[PDB]
Subunit: 426 residues, 4 copies
């Protein structure tokens, strides 16, 4: 139909308690109506985040059994190095345990104090200039590649601040607003030409780059018949490097990396490792983990894997939408946001409608959701890769639909004291 069956079989499961409502209420009480303080063993479906809770393949698990734990010269590192080179086309790679990690070196490495960094990604040394196209900012409405950079604004910045004062342009693919919005291959190539004209560097935040690639393949004219791998290799052809949190699109539970083409930039990058470590290593990334990341990255290239990933989120969004549930449109490639203000018009900001909606979803279904501030009150439903089925999406949708039909019953809360905050029903 519109929704493809999973392009894999289950190799192993994680059993669940399957605690009833009365029990879920107790737990919810004890967590003080704060979903973020719920124990993992008490949740059926955990949609808190799409970061690090991916299900790995049996291939990745075989790879975890072959960790070459040398401090240096690890064969797992060559594996990863070769994979990134081949798929992303970047010369050098500096592995980190976190994306944040990769992000730090680059900044250190590429920003002189009082220089500018601009990007589509909405303060130390640098000033960030949000250069996204203005209807990126928008909700409800649809412009396909909402995260595209506004070339007039980029050109303008260049004009009035000088190319010399621009550290680099940072383009996130996909950009993480409204559940991840795509960037066109057309805009990536335009950006490369304008910037290159002024000797400006371009770094991508490649975290959900496979998600981006699917959007391109699916909706950008001329890419209909290209491989995800072909799209991925071309996207990166327009950047000087990238930073990646492998915990998202690499189908791993940990890892990140910093990539570049620049010899010099590279050299220096290793130095900073040395200054921060004393000895250059794998940024405290086990050999087994580099191996699993290398295998996961290639697995991410299967079209059926990413099509199914995106449409599962799509499916939840659709189901919610066609029942009248107040959701934020357009639906991203990795999360669905409930509109808490519309959901609970009866409660005011002061009675924490999102917080309270999150609590009810859990009491009714065994589903954990995250309260938001995206500044509208949204309850986020973020979906990890390969962990859940459509039947699991049905559990989530059905319960929210029934909640919605009784929205009036959702009671407000009071701070009987945040990720630490404890509350009580007013």
């Amino acid at each position: 139909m519109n929704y493809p069956a999973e392009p894999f079989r289950i190799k192993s499961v994680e059993t669940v308690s399957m605690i009833p409502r009365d029990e879920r209420l107790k737990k919810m009480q004890e967590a003080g109506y704060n979903t973020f303080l719920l124990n993992s063993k008490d949740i059926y479906i955990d949609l808190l985040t799409d970061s690090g809770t991916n299900a790995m393949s049996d291939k990745q698990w075989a790879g975890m059994m072959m960790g070459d734990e040398a401090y240096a010269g690890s064969e797992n590192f060559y594996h990863l190095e070769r994979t990134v080179q081949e798929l992303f086309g970047f010369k050098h790679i500096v592995p980190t345990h976190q994306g944040r990690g990769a992000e730090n070196l680059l900044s250190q490495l590429a920003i002189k104090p009082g220089q500018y960094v601009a990007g589509n990604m909405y303060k130390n040394g640098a000033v960030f200039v949000d250069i996204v196209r203005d209807e990126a900012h928008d909700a409800g409405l649809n412009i396909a590649f909402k995260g595209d950079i506004d070339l007039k604004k980029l050109q303008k910045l260049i004009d009035e601040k000088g190319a010399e004062n621009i550290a680099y342009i940072c383009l996130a693919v996909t950009v993480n607003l409204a559940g991840g919005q795509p960037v066109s291959m057309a805009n990536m190539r335009a950006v490369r030409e304008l910037t290159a004209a002024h000797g400006i560097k371009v770094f991508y935040d490649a975290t959900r780059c496979v998600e981006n690639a699917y959007f391109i393949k699916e909706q950008e004219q001329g890419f209909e018949n290209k491989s995800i791998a072909e799209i991925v290799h071309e996207m990166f052809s327009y950047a000087d490097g990238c930073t990646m949190s492998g915990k998202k699109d690499c189908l791993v539970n940990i890892g990140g990396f910093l990539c570049m083409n620049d010899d010099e930039m590279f050299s220096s990058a290793k130095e900073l490792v040395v200054v921060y470590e004393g000895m250059p290593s794998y940024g405290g990334l086990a050999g087994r983990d580099m191996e699993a990341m290398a295998i996961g990255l290639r697995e991410a290239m299967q079209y059926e894997y990413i099509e199914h990933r995106v449409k599962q989120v799509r499916y939840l969004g659709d189901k919610l939408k066609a029942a009248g549930v107040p959701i934020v449109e357009p639906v991203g490639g990795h999360a669905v946001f409930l509109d808490a203000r519309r959901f609970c018009e009866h409660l005011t900001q002061d009675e924490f409608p999102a917080q309270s909606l999150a609590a009810s979803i859990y009491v009714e279904t065994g589903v954990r959701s995250m309260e938001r501030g995206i500044k509208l009150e949204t309850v986020r439903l973020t979906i990890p890769r390969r962990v859940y089925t459509y039947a699991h999406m049905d559990v989530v949708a059905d319960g929210i639909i029934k909640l919605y039909q009784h929205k009036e019953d959702i009671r407000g809360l009071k701070f009987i004291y945040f990720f630490t905050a404890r509350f009580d029903y007013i």
Copy 2:
């Protein structure tokens, strides 16, 4: 709807090729239109058997990392013995590498030459005492697996009390893809047999699937646990033999359980007389551990309700579309009626094999032609491996083929004759 979402999350996946129709046709041609000859790597969904392709949990995998491989006094053996004692309520257990190994140990311990054996599912003479309806495939009757008490009485009477080794009760019984045996039938058989001092041994291979049926259908058990039903089932038996490969959620193993102290000693000597030293009959410590853990997981109501209903979901969708299926749907398989499906073909024009071949080409699903005699195509479902979406791939494929039954060409031999036979279209 009527069907529960999986009571588990996916911990790891097995990646699949997802080869297109064009390559499937070719592989089919190459396999000689014999699905038994297809390679595992070329199969999307493999419904050939429910035996041994079960997905283990992460707890089962943690057990696999801790096998105590001592030849004697293994911690794993103790865990397995405890577990079975507690849930089956059998005093003694003889681990084996296969169901079939436990059986032949029983047959060689409990039968005197020329003695009869009587049961619901098929030296020695085999007497079939299952009620007559067991034999009617189109008839939707509950607990079709029940033994005919009168047929028992007749056997008892004409041959006498010790001309009978024992009575063999298979739960569920493997005709029509697992038909249950009511507890009432089990309490009955015991009674009649214990009076004459006769022995009853159960084939516990799909005993949890049977338990689910009793709890779901046998007026009186609605509020009894799966563990409570199981425990009582075996209170009406002298022992059982179990193939772990089925309801224990493991890929290998079985065991022989008895209550009789003597028989146990005889049994044990018979292992020392086959091996040299008493063993765990070619069962690794890691395997006894995973099997112990799996028996326990098999007892969660939500697990088994989900298991049986996923099968029923497949059955219902076929049923409601007019696809001729065996009834009632069993606990682990759905059988298509190939004769009625392909009325245009002849036993001679091999309707089952051709049906099975077309199914594969159309969907990437492997089924095996069968007979239970009746000419069927068996869709056997492994535990915790597939989803509802996977059931749909299977269901939609068969329905489209059904809507063109007439287009299914017949086959001829172009050469046991089952597992190796090659065919060509007519």
Copy 3:
């Protein structure tokens, strides 16, 4: 010195209790001075058998994570078939769950009732054609396992050519803990037998251990690879049966290999006639993968030289201290002469059992009383599990006991009678 350091690093360990002498005595008492009755958790070093307690490599563990558990067309089966074809040079392979399962499949395929079988290691009549020295335990002669060609000729002659099923060659032969068979003996036996059209099947269980001996002792093989020796060994046979649990570095599995096309078909039908469907005879896909990988690892010269020399190291230290041992030392075990050790006791006062009991109390090492008849204590060594330091714990313990042989009290029964027997001091 004379003994190589391990050709491997430790990837993971198995933790041990390290219980003191006082608690060991008690456990011994509780086990009734029967080491067979000790619990695995109470043992420091377990030298009961070399069968199945082998340590697998991380490559073998990566294989275990990738079992393709399809009932037919498993990728694992293909890997295993390739591997054996290539190294053993046998055309066909029938996987089995045990060595013993492969054997009985052979015996039931290659023997006609009343036929004799002849070999070096012990319906049907068993003729022992090994040279007479094989039988002298105190005699240090090389290649003690060789078949007496004249004894063969005599058997051939008095009973005639087809009154003989086949000739059974065990390499190494399991008397004196693994005595080798020279290639020359193997080329000879073939010759004589192929003339009369007679069949030779090898018991390849410890075939790599045999290869090491040939390469080390048989003038001519010094520069031939372990793989080259192995390959040629099996060029003199019709097939073999192998217990994977020994030289394949796995905890379970075996196989039947033949060259004969017909026999293979018969064999295969005999699995379909025991199972219903041709199987992998209760061998998981993960297991065929680990066994394939293990055969290959068994071929590294450094692995097997280390294996055999670690055993020899134990032998040398006993030897040089005056401890009465069986000679020459075999490829996988050292046997103490209990009669000579404990000259003060009588067959009646159970010298072996008491020796084995004292060893345990003193060192935390489990050995088993044996007979090969001669009354010994067998110290069997698993592959890649222990170190030289572990050999020392064993060696020093026995030497201290030796220096007080006289203090070893005799035992009596306070009750097969082997595996369950309980004793008390005299």
Copy 4:
């Protein structure tokens, strides 16, 4: 004897290539005589560092199979939290992926610019005052607990800078100089009293705290009969918290943690996580890794495990020492340093004697060592936990002894261009 056999069995191995000398020379050439540029697959024994290459138990590996990957409320985190609380007696724990990580928060958390930090551990905001006792600084000579803080110097600092200007006292146990030197329980308790008298905080660098505990148990009067666990719990009773790199003494490949008792300090610590992450998590530490760390920490408490750890290093040191090899005394608990200046008096600093010694050790034995600057030229031999045997220590010793006896042959090198530095033989 003086050297205990390993208090464990091998569960799995990592196979090695076992490349010969001529091949090792080539590799050495290609690495440009820089051991730090050697591939892991080409090394037999890798003594580069004692950081992160520990062999985990089968218990830890079972624990890696049970990773609860929730972003929050992970059961693995409770596991670890409970273990640290029980063993170290600290209230709160903030897990990190690296020790360095833990180190960073504390600094941020506990140092006001221009405050002092003093410790036994030889510049941002703070001034470090080395307060070790002066014969800590020493080589050759022996004072048992060489890392003890000089109380007169601590008192003096307090006197002239003011208690208010001291951020905290940092005590590393063991201190990492000369391969790790111990601190007395007597000195830890003295420090707590003096500091506490002035309201000064004390933080320990607990990285090799189990190593420390052994030294105390072994050489500090009154601890002879205390448990390692009893010693460990008491050491921590004298500190406000600690930072730990679990990669050392926790027998893991990754992880660290920051511990404290202070409610407030704790609260704030979480905030910093939030400022650096956005959401409080496990400092980017997988659930499987926290689980493995929890189990490893407890395993570290086995006396026989740590005694054997320390004496293995001791054994190498001893063997080297009794042959006349120039080593740095006293021998630490985790490494042996070769004196390169004395080893190669024929080469000058300018011809990089350490660098060149490291290269020769590798060419001759297949052993990788690290060039040092500890400012004497030393070649470091650092030993990972549970990976190597005494036979492996013999390989290392024997080769260095023969090198030593030919020291004159070691040729100097020239920079034909550091951890990146390539050289050539002059």
